[PDB]
């Protein structure tokens, strides 16, 4: 299973982004996924994350209500919605995929650079 992100920009606060992660490899299987970020100099932290069978969702306090998480099983991609940026959001993002902290994840994408200027 292999993971590549893309959607990483840069915006002014109150603005809007979507990231994708696609996955390649052995993509017959099914695995959840989720969305992972870290900013420079501190822990990486959980996002959202998705259950691949029911779409069933998980949110982090911080973006609740503000990002949304999707996935579309023809594509085999994972998406994360951003609205409302804030200049905190501003991180690396990383997708991964496992099976439902960050230690159910068996593989990790790249990475792609958000940033929200104030």
């Known amino acids: 299973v292999q993971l590549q992100e893309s959607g990483g920009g840069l915006v002014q606060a109150g603005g809007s982004l979507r990231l994708s992660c696609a996955a390649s490899?052995?993509?017959?299987?099914?695995?959840?996924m989720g969305w992972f970020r870290q900013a420079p100099g501190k822990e990486r932290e959980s996002v959202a994350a998705?259950?691949?069978?029911?779409?069933?969702?998980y949110y982090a306090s911080s973006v609740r209500g503000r990002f949304t998480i999707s996935r579309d099983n023809a594509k085999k991609t994972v998406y994360l919605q951003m609205n409302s940026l804030k200049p905190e959001d501003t991180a690396v993002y990383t997708c991964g995929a496992g099976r439902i902290r960050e230690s159910w994840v068996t593989w990790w994408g790249q990475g792609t650079q958000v940033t929200v200027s104030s």
């Open positions: 490899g052995a993509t017959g299987s099914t695995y959840d």
């Open positions: 998705i259950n691949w069978g029911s779409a069933g969702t």
